[PDB]
């Protein structure tokens, strides 16, 4: 019949930080493709709510309460996922926080909280998952990075951007170490994506954000989930150590004047 | 997994061999009808016959991508055969070698003309039909050579592949109000019929310098193009995806050898 | 005494397209450092005016009328420069035009005019200069590229951006071929630089351009000349095939909102 | 050629050896007074004595870059010795090796702490003095490893070097109203005292994989930092300059071999 990509139905995934925002969208996109998904988070109430919301998906979404900055929780997460699903094929190293603080105000704890969730939590879940991902014979790691850091700057986010670029520096070497294991590791770099959190500002400001983007809208969490889904396919086995910016063209204009001359 | 592309309409320039034929076959397997272009009627005919069993219908238009009139003719004939046009794979590419001293104006124009001007002209000629589709997709076949790497003898080739990307970073902005996205696949070293004539020692040396330990397949490029063409990639534009098994990552063979 | 870089006094340079704008600034910066400079251009009146304006510089600025898109003129330029100066050490492949046209309006001639000056004219002057630059034992090629093409998009400039990215694709290979000749080749990527031409718009619009740039001003042609001067130094002999963006931070903000949150 | 930097005031973190000592010597030769930092008083003392004949005065402050209090102390002592502070070279860097499986939390924090947090803390502590100078300059010593390349065993090192750049792309915007620029040099393979203990075969193998055919010198990095520090580089900020002899350009040793 018609064939696009090979179905991922019945494979096993972890989405760290999966109870809300982009991570929830990644989880729902994989579950709609028939992949069983464990989402992680620190807040059991939020995890339970998201598991309930997603109860009708084809693949089964369940939760593990875990702190990505603790390697022992990362190992517990992988073990619990393998127990529930039977193995582990896909890790979406997604968990991310984005508090703001100008350079002169950032404390050591501010810097370590952001680097610890965003960067160390990516490393630790990949480390815990290596043996199972190797055993799968088609392991996939997708990292949720950002345009902020690798490409752009944004006042108040110099530690955030540092952490998102750190993920990429890490994976450019990790892809080489993981190639003999037949695991690929790539990152999605979201631009400005509409989430529950951004709903807490007015249409005025959201319209200003959209008008600065060539696509003329903020992205959806499904836009990120679908990019991660492509990297997870068998058909992406020759893509590794790489990045895909998903931003409706946000990084392209040199300024709003270039947008306006349209 | 993704919304079916069955029944949509695609052009793949330079589709009779190599990466283009892989792109064509990948879309045709997805049920997309595909017009491939090329200058060699025999190669086109051969590939049309080879792919006669695909779900989507693969047919050929003989056309020189360096000629805007052939580009307009290719689009018109595709709209006539299929009913419209959803996807343009601006793929045609040549890669003759010449050291900088040896490159003549004609050498430079032949490579810039096929690889860069032929991408611009097919996009230009397809603009109206792609706009009417409401979900238009352009996928450009670039290269790691030019945008990322250097390779002696390919300074004009690398220039033309980087030129494609400079073009589409602006084109993406001009095309966004028409709901057309434009993105590029940057292949590394892909096993094609031509590379299969090199001998196993040569292919083994090439593969051993790549972290994945093999050359890619033309389907690797076809499937990246297929992703960009999905409705689910509507928020991706002006962007690149390198499909190279890790080729660009090591600083040197010493890094590969540390594995 | 105090030593910064090794003096370039008495070396020999070509600046293509040097009668106005960035190229004039490159020429004046090299001439102030004691380098003799041949500027090229198609308009003898403009060349003569610039030679007159620069008559007091330490190094001597003179002109050759030549079309960068003609390899025979590129060879004549190199020969005339060697005749006037005694050799050739530095080539600034600068000539650039930037007409605007939307994608649906660009003709083959529009595309070839821009690719021919901006890209082919860079290749042809480097080709003509190779034997003399090799003989110098410290050859330098500096390419004037742009943020537009390599990094940004700007409606109406898709052929312009293509041509500026083509220069970089070319030089990433050229640097390898030229390394055994001890010639380096690098590019400056200017952002928005104030020139005679931009003076033909109002302070209103120029202020809007500056306000979109972290440095809070448009750049000067000396900013580009000084970057090219660094690449030309003996102290830059280990820099090759590379780029330096000179733009006051223009490419960094994700949008004007990031600038405004400052 | 450029405006003399004579009499200005610089800090070079990790200045007692390797690239940092080259940066220090290059600025001191330009007549800039330089405070180098390090944890090893003997190495600092040795380098201060070696450079006693420079035009600018090189002196040492013993300090751990991972400690913000030491960063504030380094700035205060530099302002006291020199009268102010014009230039910070955030250079300190370590590069222990460990495969991904073997890296402990402590391994990762040691490298992130020196290479990334130590860059942030010295910039933070210098903000006020750099602002008062009216022409403040920060130059970060990053690496091709992380931002560009991958090297087995250096995934935490590469992360920390890319982290520096993500930081300075925002820092550049925050610092611009203060007239401070911030830029990074990305060294390739540089001949240091440590690399000189490897044997000629090893150094020859490394050099043969680089288009320039040699390892760079610590002065190559020092002179790129010196350019960023000039008044003539005031319109350069948030940017990178790779100093690597072409190392990142070839896709593989085969490309180098075609020369
Ligand atoms: Cl990065
Ligand atoms: Cl490019
Ligand atoms: Cl480029
Ligand atoms: Cl980076």
Q: Which one of the ligands is nearest to B162 CA?
A: 2
Is residue C20 a contact partner of residue C195, using CB atoms and an 8 Å limit?
yes
Collect all residues with Cβ–Cβ distance below 8 Å to A206 and sequence separation of at least 6: A194, A198, A218
Tell me the Ramachandran region of residue C156: left when phi exceeds 0, alpha when psi lies from -120 to 50, beta otherwise.
left
Residue with tokens 């389907």: B219
Q: In what order do the strands lie in the sheet with B33-38?
A: B58-62, B33-38, B9-12, B87-90, B137-141, B181-187, B240-243
Measured between CB atoms, which of A2, A214, A241 is closest to B30?
A2
Is residue D75 a contact partner of residue D11, using CB atoms and an 8 Å limit?
yes
Kindly list the distances between the CA atom of residue D173 and the CA atoms of B154, C161, D86, D148, D239, in Å, as whole numbers in the listed order. Answer: 38, 25, 19, 23, 11
Is residue A187 a contact partner of residue A168, using CB atoms and an 8 Å limit?
yes
Measured between CB atoms, which of A2, A175, A247 is closest to B211?
A175
Q: C123, B117: Cβ pair inside 8 Å? A: no
Residue with tokens 């603080």: A101
Helix, strand, or coil (residue D243): strand
D147 CA → ligand 4 middle, Å: 4
Is residue B60 a contact partner of residue B44, using CB atoms and an 8 Å limit?
yes
Residue with tokens 């960023």: D228
Phi, then psi, of C144 in degrees rounded to 5: -90, 105
Is residue D228 a contact partner of residue D139, using CB atoms and an 8 Å limit?
yes
Q: Which residues of C13-47 are buried (b: 16+ CB within 10 A; e: fewer)?
A: bbbbbbbbbbbbbbbbbbbbbbbbbbbbbbeeebb
Give contacts of A 202-221 with B, CB under 8 A.
214-216, 219-220
Q: How far apart are CA C166 and CA B202, in angstroms?
A: 30
Is residue C32 a contact partner of residue C55, using CB atoms and an 8 Å limit?
no
| C193 DSSP assignment | B
Measured between CB atoms, which of A108, A157, A162 is closest to D116?
A162
Q: How far apart are CA C196 and CA C220, in angstroms?
A: 11
Is residue B71 a contact partner of residue B48, using CB atoms and an 8 Å limit?
no
Q: Residues D115, D117, D118, D122: is their CA dihedral positive or negative?
A: positive
Collect all residues with Cβ–Cβ distance below 8 Å to D77 and sequence separation of at least 6: D35, D61
Show the beta-strand stretches assigned E in chain A: 12-15, 36-41, 61-65, 90-93, 140-144, 184-190, 243-246
Q: Which one of the ligands is nearest to B161 CA?
A: 2
Phi, then psi, of D153 in degrees rounded to 5: 95, -15
Phi, then psi, of C68 in degrees rounded to 5: -60, -20
Beta carbons within 10 angstroms of residue A129's beta carbon: 26
Q: How far apart are CA D132 and CA C215, in angstroms?
A: 17
Shortest distance, CA B209 to any CA of chain D (angstroms): 6
Q: How far apart are CA A249 and CA C235, in angstroms?
A: 39
Residue B5: closest CA among B24, B30, B23: B30
C228 CA → ligand 4 middle, Å: 24
| C60 DSSP assignment | P
Q: How many residues does chain C have?
A: 262
Is residue B62 a contact partner of residue B35, using CB atoms and an 8 Å limit?
no
Contact residues on chain C for B178, CB-CB shorter than 8 A: none
Active-site amino acid positions of B: 157
Q: How far apart are CA C113 and CA C160, in angstroms?
A: 10
Is residue C242 a contact partner of residue D242, using CB atoms and an 8 Å limit?
yes
According to the annotation, is D65 in a ligand binding site? Answer: yes
DSSP states of C205-259: HHHHHHHTSTTSS-B-HHHHHHHHHHHHSGGGTT--S-EEEESTTTTSBSSHHHH
- In this structure, the strands spanning B9-12 and B87-90 are parallel
Q: How far apart are CA A103 and CA D174, in angstroms?
A: 7
Token pair recorded at residue B57: 């219908």
Q: How far apart are CA C13 and CA A242, in angstroms?
A: 41
Interchain contact D13–C (C-beta under 8 A)? no
Contacts of A among chains (3+ CB pairs under 8 A): B, C, D
Q: How far apart are CA B60 and CA C29, in angstroms?
A: 57
A100 CA → ligand 4 middle, Å: 20
In the PDB record, what is the listed experimental method? X-ray
**∠A146-A147-A153 over CA atoms, to 5°?**
115
Q: How far apart are CA C130 and CA C124, in angstroms?
A: 10
Contacts of C among chains (3+ CB pairs under 8 A): A, B, D
Q: How far apart are CA C110 and CA C95, in angstroms?
A: 16
End-to-end Cα, chain A, rounded Å: 43
Helix, strand, or coil (residue A81): helix
| Test the C interface: residue of A98, A101, A254 with most C CBs within 10 Å | A254
Token pair recorded at residue B119: 């991408």
Is residue A97 a contact partner of residue A114, using CB atoms and an 8 Å limit?
yes
Beta carbons within 10 angstroms of residue B94's beta carbon: 14
Where helices occur in chain C by DSSP H, the ranges are 21-32, 44-53, 71-85, 108-115, 121-136, 158-178, 203-211, 221-232, 256-260
Is residue D231 a contact partner of residue D135, using CB atoms and an 8 Å limit?
yes
Collect all residues with Cβ–Cβ distance below 8 Å to B237 and sequence separation of at least 6: A214, A215, A248, A249, B172, B175, B176, B181, B182, B183
| D187 DSSP assignment | E
Q: Which one of the ligands is nearest to A145 CA?
A: 1
Is residue B122 a contact partner of residue B74, using CB atoms and an 8 Å limit?
yes
Q: How far apart are CA B112 and CA B118, in angstroms?
A: 8
Token pair recorded at residue C22: 């960035």
Measured between CB atoms, which of A1, A4, A248 is closest to B2?
A4
Shortest distance, CA C53 to any CA of chain D (angstroms): 20
Phi, then psi, of D175 in degrees rounded to 5: -85, -20
Note every long-range contact of A47-54, with CB atoms under 8 Å and residues 24 or more positions apart, other chains counting: A47/A19, A49/A19, A50/A18, A50/A19, A50/A20, A50/A24, A54/A27, A54/A28
Token pair recorded at residue D53: 């004949």
**Rg (alpha carbons) of chain B, rounded to whole number:** 18
Q: How far apart are CA D28 and CA D35, in angstroms?
A: 10
End-to-end Cα, chain C, rounded Å: 43
Task: State the SS3 of A143-191.
Answer: EECCCECCCEECCCCHHHHHHHHHHHHHHHHHHHHHHHHCCEEEEEEEC
Burial of A203 (0-12, 13-18, 19+ CB in 10 A): exposed
Interchain contact B255–D (C-beta under 8 A)? yes
Token pair recorded at residue A189: 């770099």
Give contacts of B 161-200 with A, CB under 8 A.
169-170, 172-174, 176-177
Burial of A163 (0-12, 13-18, 19+ CB in 10 A): buried
Q: How far apart are CA D90 and CA D10, in angstroms?
A: 10
Token pair recorded at residue B137: 């997709």
Size of interface C-D (CB pairs under 8 A): 134
Helix, strand, or coil (residue B253): helix
Q: What is the helix (H) or strand (E) element at residue B37, kind and residue range? A: strand B33-38
Residue numbering of the annotated binding site of C for NADP(+): 19-20, 22, 42-43, 67-68, 94, 160, 164, 193, 195, 197
Q: How far apart are CA B183 and CA A71, in angstroms?
A: 38
| A102 DSSP assignment | -
Is residue A41 a contact partner of residue A47, using CB atoms and an 8 Å limit?
yes
Burial of C181 (0-12, 13-18, 19+ CB in 10 A): middle
Q: How far apart are CA C26 and CA D232, in angstroms?
A: 13
B242 CA → ligand 1 middle, Å: 15
Helix, strand, or coil (residue D77): helix
Residue with tokens 């930097």: D5
According to the annotation, is B217 in a ligand binding site? Answer: no
Is residue A130 a contact partner of residue A80, using CB atoms and an 8 Å limit?
no
- Alpha carbon D90 to chain centroid, angstroms: 5
Give contacts of C 225-254 with D, CB under 8 A.
226-227, 229-230, 233, 235-242, 244-249, 251-253
Q: How many residues does chain D have?
A: 259
Domains of chain B plus CATH, in order, are 1-259 (3.40.50.720)
According to the annotation, is B91 in a ligand binding site? Answer: yes
Q: Residues C130, C132, C136, C137: is their CA dihedral positive or negative?
A: positive
Which residues face A246 on adjacent strands? A190
Q: How far apart are CA D20 and CA D103, in angstroms?
A: 26
Q: How far apart are CA A131 and CA D259, in angstroms?
A: 42
Q: How far apart are CA C204 and CA C70, in angstroms?
A: 40
Where helices occur in chain B by DSSP H, the ranges are 18-29, 41-50, 68-82, 105-112, 118-133, 155-175, 200-208, 218-229, 253-257
Kindly list the distances between the CA atom of residue A92 and the CA atoms of A121, A184, B68, in Å, as whole numbers in the listed order. Answer: 11, 12, 45
Shortest distance, CA C228 to any CA of chain A (angstroms): 23
Q: In what order do the strands lie in the sheet with D33-38?
A: D58-62, D33-38, D9-12, D87-90, D137-141, D181-187, D240-243
Q: How far apart are CA D116 and CA C187, in angstroms?
A: 29
SS3 content of chain D, % helix, strand, coil (to 5): 50, 15, 35
Contacts of B among chains (3+ CB pairs under 8 A): A, C, D
Kindly list the distances between the CA atom of residue A149 and the CA atoms of A166, A169, B227, D183, in Å, as whole numbers in the listed order. Answer: 9, 11, 26, 14
Collect all residues with Cβ–Cβ distance below 8 Å to D132 and sequence separation of at least 6: D84
Q: How far apart are CA C118 and CA B158, in angstroms?
A: 16
Measured between CB atoms, which of A115, A150, A170 is closest to D158?
A170
A162 CA → ligand 4 middle, Å: 8
Collect all residues with Cβ–Cβ distance below 8 Å to A203 and sequence separation of at least 6: none
Q: What is the helix (H) or strand (E) element at residue C61, kind and residue range? A: strand C61-65
Q: How far apart are CA C159 and CA A232, in angstroms?
A: 36
Phi, then psi, of A55 in degrees rounded to 5: -65, -20
| Test the D interface: residue of C7, C25, C238, C242 with most D CBs within 10 Å | C238
Q: C209, A147: Cβ pair inside 8 Å? A: no
Token pair recorded at residue D43: 């190495």
Token pair recorded at residue B155: 């300074």
**Rg (alpha carbons) of chain A, rounded to whole number:** 18
Q: B250, D151: Cβ pair inside 8 Å? A: yes
Residue A24: closest CA among A221, A215, A231, A214: A221
Q: How far apart are CA D137 and CA D135, in angstroms?
A: 7
- In this structure, the strands spanning A36-41 and B33-38 are unpaired
Q: Give chain D's largest Cα–Cα span.
A: 56
Q: Which residues of A8-40 are buried (b: 16+ CB within 10 A; e: fewer)?
A: beebbbbbbbbbbbbbbbbbbbbbbbbbbbbbb
Neighbours of ion ligand 4 (CB under 5 A): A 165; D 147, 162, 165
DSSP states of D107-173: HHHHHHIIIIIHHHHHHHHHHHHHHHHSS-EEEEE--SBTTTBB-TT-HHHHHHHHHHHHHHHHHHH
B31 CA → ligand 2 middle, Å: 32
Contact residues on chain D for C252, CB-CB shorter than 8 A: 169-170, 172-173, 238
Angle between helices C158-178 and C121-136 (to 10 degrees): 20
User: Which of these is catalytic: A124, A154, A160, A205?
Assistant: A160
DSSP states of D90-125: E---------GGG--HHHHHHHHIIIIIHHHHHHHH
A34 CA → ligand 3 middle, Å: 40
Contact residues on chain C for B147, CB-CB shorter than 8 A: 165, 169
Q: How far apart are CA D33 and CA B71, in angstroms?
A: 65
């Amino acid at each position: 019949g018609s064939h696009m990509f090979t179905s991922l139905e019945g494979r096993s995934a972890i989405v760290t930080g999966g109870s809300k925002g982009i991570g929830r969208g990644i989880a729902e996109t994989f579950a709609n493709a028939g992949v069983d998904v464990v989402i992680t988070g620190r807040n059991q109430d939020d995890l339970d709510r998201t598991v309930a919301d997603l109860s009708g998906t084809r693949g089964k979404v369940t939760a593990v309460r875990a702190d990505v900055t603790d390697p022992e929780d990362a190992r517990r997460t992988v073990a619990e996922t393998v127990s529930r699903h039977g193995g582990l094929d896909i890790v979406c190293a997604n968990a991310g926080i984005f508090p703001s603080g100008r350079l002169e105000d950032l404390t050591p704890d501010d810097i370590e909280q952001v680097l610890g969730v965003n960067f160390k939590g990516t490393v630790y879940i990949v480390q815990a998952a290596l043996q199972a991902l190797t055993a799968s014979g088609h392991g996939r790691v997708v990292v949720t990075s950002s345009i902020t850091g690798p490409i752009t700057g944004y006042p108040g986010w110099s530690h955030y951007g540092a952490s998102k670029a750190a993920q990429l520096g890490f994976l450019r070497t990790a892809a080489m170490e993981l190639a003999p294991k037949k695991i690929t590791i790539n990152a999605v770099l979201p631009g400005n994506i509409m989430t529950e959190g951004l709903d807490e500002m007015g249409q005025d400001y959201l319209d200003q954000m959209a008008s600065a983007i060539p696509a003329g809208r903020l992205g959806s969490v499904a836009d990120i989930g679908n990019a991660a889904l492509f990297f997870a396919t068998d058909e992406a086995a020759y893509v590794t150590g790489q990045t895909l910016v998903v931003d409706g063209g946000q990084v392209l204009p040199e300024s709003h004047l270039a947008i306006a001359e349209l």
